[PDB]
UniProtKB/Swiss-Prot annotation, chain A:
<dbReference type="GO" id="GO:0033179">
    <property type="term" value="C:proton-transporting V-type ATPase, V0 domain"/>
</dbReference>
<dbReference type="InterPro" id="IPR050873">
    <property type="entry name" value="V-ATPase_V0D/AC39_subunit"/>
</dbReference>
<protein>
    <recommendedName>
        <fullName>V-type ATP synthase subunit C</fullName>
    </recommendedName>
</protein>
<comment type="function">
    <text>Produces ATP from ADP in the presence of a proton gradient across the membrane.</text>
</comment>
<keyword id="KW-0406">Ion transport</keyword>
<dbReference type="InterPro" id="IPR014272">
    <property type="entry name" value="ATPase_V0-cplx_csu"/>
</dbReference>
<dbReference type="GO" id="GO:0046961">
    <property type="term" value="F:proton-transporting ATPase activity, rotational mechanism"/>
</dbReference>
From Swiss-Prot, chain B:
<dbReference type="GO" id="GO:0046961">
    <property type="term" value="F:proton-transporting ATPase activity, rotational mechanism"/>
</dbReference>
<dbReference type="Pfam" id="PF01990">
    <property type="entry name" value="ATP-synt_F"/>
</dbReference>
<dbReference type="GO" id="GO:0042777">
    <property type="term" value="P:proton motive force-driven plasma membrane ATP synthesis"/>
</dbReference>
<keyword id="KW-0375">Hydrogen ion transport</keyword>
<dbReference type="InterPro" id="IPR022944">
    <property type="entry name" value="ATPase_V1-cplx_fsu_bac/arc"/>
</dbReference>
<keyword id="KW-0406">Ion transport</keyword>
<comment type="function">
    <text>Produces ATP from ADP in the presence of a proton gradient across the membrane.</text>
</comment>
From Swiss-Prot, chain C:
<keyword id="KW-0813">Transport</keyword>
<dbReference type="GO" id="GO:0042777">
    <property type="term" value="P:proton motive force-driven plasma membrane ATP synthesis"/>
</dbReference>
<keyword id="KW-0406">Ion transport</keyword>
<keyword id="KW-0375">Hydrogen ion transport</keyword>
<comment type="function">
    <text>Produces ATP from ADP in the presence of a proton gradient across the membrane.</text>
</comment>
<keyword id="KW-0066">ATP synthesis</keyword>
<protein>
    <recommendedName>
        <fullName>V-type ATP synthase subunit D</fullName>
    </recommendedName>
</protein>
Amino acid sequence: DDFAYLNARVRVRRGTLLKESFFQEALDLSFADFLRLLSETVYGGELAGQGLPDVDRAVLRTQAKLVGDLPRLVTGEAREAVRLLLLRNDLHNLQALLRAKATGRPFEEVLLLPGTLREEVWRQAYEAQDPAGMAQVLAVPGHPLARALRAVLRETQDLARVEALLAKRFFEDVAKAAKGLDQPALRDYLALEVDAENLRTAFKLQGSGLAPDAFFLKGGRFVDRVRFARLMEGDYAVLDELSGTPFSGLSGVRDLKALERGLRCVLLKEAKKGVQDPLGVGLVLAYVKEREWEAVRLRLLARRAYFGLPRAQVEEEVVC
Amino acid sequence: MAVIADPETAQGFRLAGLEGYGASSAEEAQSLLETLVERGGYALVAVDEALLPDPERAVERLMRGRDLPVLLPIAGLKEAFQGHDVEGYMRELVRKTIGFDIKL
Amino acid sequence: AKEAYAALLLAQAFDGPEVVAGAALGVPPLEGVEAEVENVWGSKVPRLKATFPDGALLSPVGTPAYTLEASRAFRRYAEALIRVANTETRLKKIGEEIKKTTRRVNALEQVV
């Protein structure tokens, strides 16, 4: 409820962040220098041993320690708001769970990264006869995925098209809840994420020839459904049509790698606008996205040091 | 099919829909090689160069006949900054094959 | 190889390790390769054909983005892999057939 008592610990955690020189000096290391610098870092407090997998497990434990508590320590409308910040890992865990239930591998098959609800609920959801019964076992009150999967659950028993339509309805109900809050910037950031995901589905499905209206979603403000069909066709001018919006530098690109790189750049730049709101909740969302950019930078530098990457090989990864 | 290089390498192949294994030591690489040879896997096995250079040994000891799990000394990615020295591999191959190394 | 390992490094760097484990444990049927017949100078040799579950791919709405580029990458990787396999096996058999002929020539000459 209190968007300030959490904001104080948010400012404290914002005080615990690495500078750009911490990665700029990390452009030249040999994973032992990187291990020593991470040993200086707070994320190396869970530093178990040596090796890339130990480094990634320590990074996941540090992310759970510094980022997982934000889902806790709050109650009310602020809890309903801050729940829809670290939601991608939860939807990914639910998607892997649906894939495992439809596939047939072991319930300990996927590694089940940390999200919002109890992992014991995810273990208990491995055994459920009805999909609606599994949804009710996974039903939290303010979980948007619980309301999304139940509404999408009135089609069949367990289908992959049900899973894709459930992801579409998940993004749709996320946009509906983002419109259904008293937050001036969280709705804008969620809508920017929705339009970027629409562009990402368009670039991933460009040339597929499928139905774009079945692929296009609702909730954005930066593009059009006709612009969506133009992006579905081989027309980069629609990507050039993005002028004045946050999709500014996204122009003249056809390769999806640098396209989604600049998309993440625009998303992080919009997330940088969250420091303007010291009283609401978007500052905490900015802190979460900052830890996310730090996490991408950490696993990137970890891969670079473990495989000996060139500085030119990852030069397009720290430009913003 | 199947490959063995490294868990970080093998998870890309498992993402291809292709059976992966991964061993840090060369003896464990022949162990996993022996595993998929005894569990005769669809006839192809790729092996990284860094673990086994010429991995013919397990199949010539075990499956001397039938030529079936085809071996490949594939290149590893931390070494694929160099690019295997493909010409030197080919020289080594013809010298192994017909004995007589010459210049192409 | 260099393009596919680059795509895999980028997808595991940016997107999480656990989610690429989760998207890769969900599997296409992975099989389909077969060792069909080739006949080269008195010897059948196995010529492999492709795997082909690539008509059946997961996540039509690709929920990660850089990971699906790696799932597209390692199919081209495995295809170039089986091409190298069913060229090098022919080269093996031709080379050893030849050196067999030379040892039969020298045996036949210097004895009979």
